[PDB]
Amino acid sequence: VAIALKAAHYHTHKE
Secondary structure: OOOOOOOOOOOOOOO
16 A cells, blocks of 8 residues: 555655
């Protein structure tokens, strides 16, 4: 459910 921006890695790559 956690929306993760592909072009804007703020959760996937950014902790």
